[PDB]
Design an enzyme around this catalytic site. Structure first.
Site, PDB file in Angstrom:
ATOM      1  N   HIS A   1       0.807  -1.020   0.021  1.00 10.88           N
ATOM      2  CA  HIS A   1      -0.006  -0.161  -0.086  1.00 10.88           C
ATOM      3  C   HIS A   1       0.711   1.303   0.064  1.00 10.88           C
ATOM      4  O   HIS A   1       0.751   2.210  -0.966  1.00 10.88           O
ATOM      5  CB  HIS A   1      -0.821   0.001   1.119  1.00 10.88           C
ATOM      6  CG  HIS A   1      -1.863   0.971   1.185  1.00 10.88           C
ATOM      7  ND1 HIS A   1      -3.108   1.138   0.791  1.00 10.88           N
ATOM      8  CD2 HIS A   1      -1.670   2.260   1.758  1.00 10.88           C
ATOM      9  CE1 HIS A   1      -3.665   2.427   0.905  1.00 10.88           C
ATOM     10  NE2 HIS A   1      -2.793   3.051   1.609  1.00 10.88           N
ATOM     11  N   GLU A   2       1.811   1.229   1.036  1.00  7.92           N
ATOM     12  CA  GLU A   2       2.629   2.591   0.854  1.00  7.92           C
ATOM     13  C   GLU A   2       3.537   2.585  -0.216  1.00  7.92           C
ATOM     14  O   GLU A   2       3.751   3.588  -0.642  1.00  7.92           O
ATOM     15  CB  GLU A   2       3.388   2.670   2.215  1.00  7.92           C
ATOM     16  CG  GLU A   2       2.652   2.539   3.611  1.00  7.92           C
ATOM     17  CD  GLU A   2       1.753   3.855   3.637  1.00  7.92           C
ATOM     18  OE1 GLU A   2       2.107   5.061   3.146  1.00  7.92           O
ATOM     19  OE2 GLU A   2       0.553   3.662   4.135  1.00  7.92           O
TER      20      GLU A   2
ATOM     21  N   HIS B   1       1.833   4.458  -2.816  1.00 13.83           N
ATOM     22  CA  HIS B   1       2.002   5.784  -3.061  1.00 13.83           C
ATOM     23  C   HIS B   1       3.408   6.140  -3.458  1.00 13.83           C
ATOM     24  O   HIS B   1       3.343   7.429  -4.258  1.00 13.83           O
ATOM     25  CB  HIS B   1       1.699   6.200  -1.665  1.00 13.83           C
ATOM     26  CG  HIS B   1       0.412   5.908  -0.836  1.00 13.83           C
ATOM     27  ND1 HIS B   1      -0.656   6.750  -1.439  1.00 13.83           N
ATOM     28  CD2 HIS B   1       0.057   5.437   0.231  1.00 13.83           C
ATOM     29  CE1 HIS B   1      -1.745   6.223  -0.861  1.00 13.83           C
ATOM     30  NE2 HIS B   1      -1.264   5.481   0.165  1.00 13.83           N
TER      31      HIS B   1
ATOM     32  N   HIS C   1      -5.036   7.151  -3.116  1.00 13.63           N
ATOM     33  CA  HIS C   1      -6.223   6.444  -2.520  1.00 13.63           C
ATOM     34  C   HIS C   1      -7.313   5.975  -3.703  1.00 13.63           C
ATOM     35  O   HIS C   1      -7.592   6.824  -4.401  1.00 13.63           O
ATOM     36  CB  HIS C   1      -6.856   6.812  -1.301  1.00 13.63           C
ATOM     37  CG  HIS C   1      -5.912   6.379  -0.051  1.00 13.63           C
ATOM     38  ND1 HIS C   1      -5.843   7.442   0.897  1.00 13.63           N
ATOM     39  CD2 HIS C   1      -4.978   5.674   0.270  1.00 13.63           C
ATOM     40  CE1 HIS C   1      -5.007   7.114   1.706  1.00 13.63           C
ATOM     41  NE2 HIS C   1      -4.464   6.152   1.433  1.00 13.63           N
TER      42      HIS C   1
HETATM   43 ZN   LIG Z   1      -2.388   5.293   1.888  1.00 22.33          ZN
END
Ligand SMILES: [Zn+2]
Ligand SMILES: *[C@@H]1O[C@H](CO)[C@@H](O[C@@H]2O[C@H](CO)[C@@H](O[C@H]3O[C@H](CO)[C@@H](O)[C@H](O[C@H]4O[C@H](CO)[C@@H](O)[C@H](O[C@H]5O[C@H](CO)[C@@H](O)[C@H](O)[C@@H]5O)[C@@H]4O)[C@@H]3O)[C@H](O)[C@H]2NC(C)=O)[C@H](O)[C@H]1NC(C)=O
Ligand SMILES: [Ca+2]
Length: 431
Positions: free
Chosen positions: A166-167, A170, A176
């Site tokens: 997830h990170e 980014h 998101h």
């Molecule tokens: Zn996030």
């Protein structure tokens, strides 16, 4: 060509405290990279395929480093924003990305923090260099943090791996997920809801559904732009594993690190000439870098030594006395109660919910949001509590409560120690 991103993984003393030894945390960072390695390679980024990761160097901190006055990570109470700012204040020009793993309980259910990449017009994300910024600090914004504790409860490797991706998402310039087309968990259709949300979902994830393992249509487009504009400046070509990253890989007998990092008297560090670097020293039969079944004095541990502790559905790991690695532990019977009678065991790992043990599925109760409400599969009208009269033949009136840090209310928040489903969203003004 240039499709692999060299990583730099650090771990503080709180992460070392949870797992105990340097071998156990190394196996954690090895498992975490191999997780995101398979997720990104099997993702089609607008024609860019087989994009992978690789560890270029590690830094395993122990509890001994907590008494170092020059170590700024030693303070137990560190905010998640400042925790990442500490990671950013280091020079990471030699790495595509740099992460630090911790075991802190961040506020508001935050499991990680990373800078968002962009094709242009914004600093941060993947492959940033160390330069002076507005706050006056020479930061490297190619950084991110992850934590394996939430509300005083450790998160399983299935959710930990997804949070790592997830990170990194980014860092690859993905915001998101938004809208019904990229968040099927909130859809009014039972077919799309069972598949769950995607990796870049802004709220809580369980990892036990189909879509939680791969990116969404929204994320792939955003990442494909950052890869087309940024990866060429830093990525390397696929090659053999490097010597000195602290992990034994194919083609090397041992791997302690470089000169200023190898404290192993049985393995030539990566500063030795070709032919002996990352090769076992004479008279030595193993190295602790290979596995837990090898003493510090570099002898094979006996066949009675315990390598891996008994888990919820993973029996004890006993050494075999002939290799430094530990054999994979045999799993317990499936549908065995794990996580304090809240979840069952799926293929040797504590996942799913207790509802599956009797042919049911997890449902959201009608504060009873941190109670387990089960339902018949495909029938939402039979959603009743575990302490009800419907399932009185299976649960016998007992009301199973969710442990702290568990998803609740259709993955909108986490349950705390007071049995409250607290939501995760946080908004702030832009400059
Ligand atoms: Zn996030
Ligand atoms: C794991 O443990 C290890 C070892 O215990 C930890 O490693 C230590 O990490 C810290 C910080 O990451 C190191 O502390 C110094 O590192 C440099 C070595 O000389 C120093 O230059 C540095 O000075 C910094 O202090 C200020 C921070 O705000 C800042 O004002 C300083 O100014 C410099 O930079 C600015 C731009 O910001 C520039 O304008 C100035 O001109 C100047 O150049 C500078 O930024 C730190 O004091 C430490 O050396 C290192 N090693 C040790 C202790 O052996 C590691 O952090 C631990 N990690 C985890 C996750 O636990
Ligand atoms: Ca290596």
């Amino acid at each position: 060509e240039k499709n692999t991103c060299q990583l730099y993984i650090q771990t503080d003393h709180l992460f070392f405290k949870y797992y105990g030894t340097r071998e156990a945390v190394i196996a954690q960072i090895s498992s975490h990279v191999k997780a995101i390695d398979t997720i990104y390679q099997t993702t089609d980024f607008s024609g860019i395929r087989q994009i992978s990761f690789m560890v270029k160097r590690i830094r395993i901190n122990t509890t001994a480093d907590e008494k170092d006055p020059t170590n700024p990570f030693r303070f137990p109470n560190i905010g998640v924003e400042k925790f990442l700012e500490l990671n950013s204040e280091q020079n990471h020009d030699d790495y595509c990305l740099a992460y630090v793993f911790t075991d802190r309980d961040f506020d508001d259910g935050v499991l990680g923090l990373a800078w968002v990449g962009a094709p242009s017009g914004s600093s941060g994300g993947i492959c940033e260099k160390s330069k002076l910024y507005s706050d006056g600090k020479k930061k490297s914004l190619n950084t991110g943090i992850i934590t394996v504790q939430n509300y005083g409860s450790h998160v399983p490797p299935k959710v930990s791996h997804i949070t790592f991706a997830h990170e990194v998402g980014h860092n690859f310039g993905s915001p998101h997920d938004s809208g019904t087309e990229c968040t099927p968990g909130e859809s009014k259709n039972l077919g799309q809801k069972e598949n769950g949300n995607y990796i870049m979902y802004a709220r809580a994830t369980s990892g036990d559904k189909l879509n939680n393992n791969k990116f969404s249509l929204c994320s792939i487009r955003q990442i494909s732009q950052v890869l087309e504009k940024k990866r060429n400046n830093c990525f390397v070509e696929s090659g053999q594993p490097i010597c000195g990253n602290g992990m034994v890989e194919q083609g090397e007998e041992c791997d302690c690190g470089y000169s200023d990092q190898c404290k192993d008297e049985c393995c030539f560090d990566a500063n030795q000439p070709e032919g002996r670097k990352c090769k076992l020293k004479p008279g030595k039969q193993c190295s602790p870098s290979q596995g837990p079944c090898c003493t510090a004095q570099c002898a094979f541990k006996s066949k009675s030594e315990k390598c891996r502790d008994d888990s919820d559905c993973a029996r004890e790991g006993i050494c075999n006395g002939f290799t430094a690695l530990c054999p994979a532990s045999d799993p317990k019977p499936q549908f065995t109660d794990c996580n304090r009678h809240t979840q069952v065991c799926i293929n040797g790992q504590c996942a799913g919910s207790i509802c599956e043990k009797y042919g049911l599925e997890e449902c959201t109760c009608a504060k009873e949001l941190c109670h387990v409400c089960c339902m018949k599969k495909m029938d939402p009208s039979t959603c009743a509590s575990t302490g009800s009269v419907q399932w009185s033949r299976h649960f016998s009136g007992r009301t199973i409560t969710l442990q702290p840090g568990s998803p609740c209310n259709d993955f909108r928040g986490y349950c705390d120690v007071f049995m409250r489903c607290r939501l995760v969203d946080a908004d702030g003004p832009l400059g």
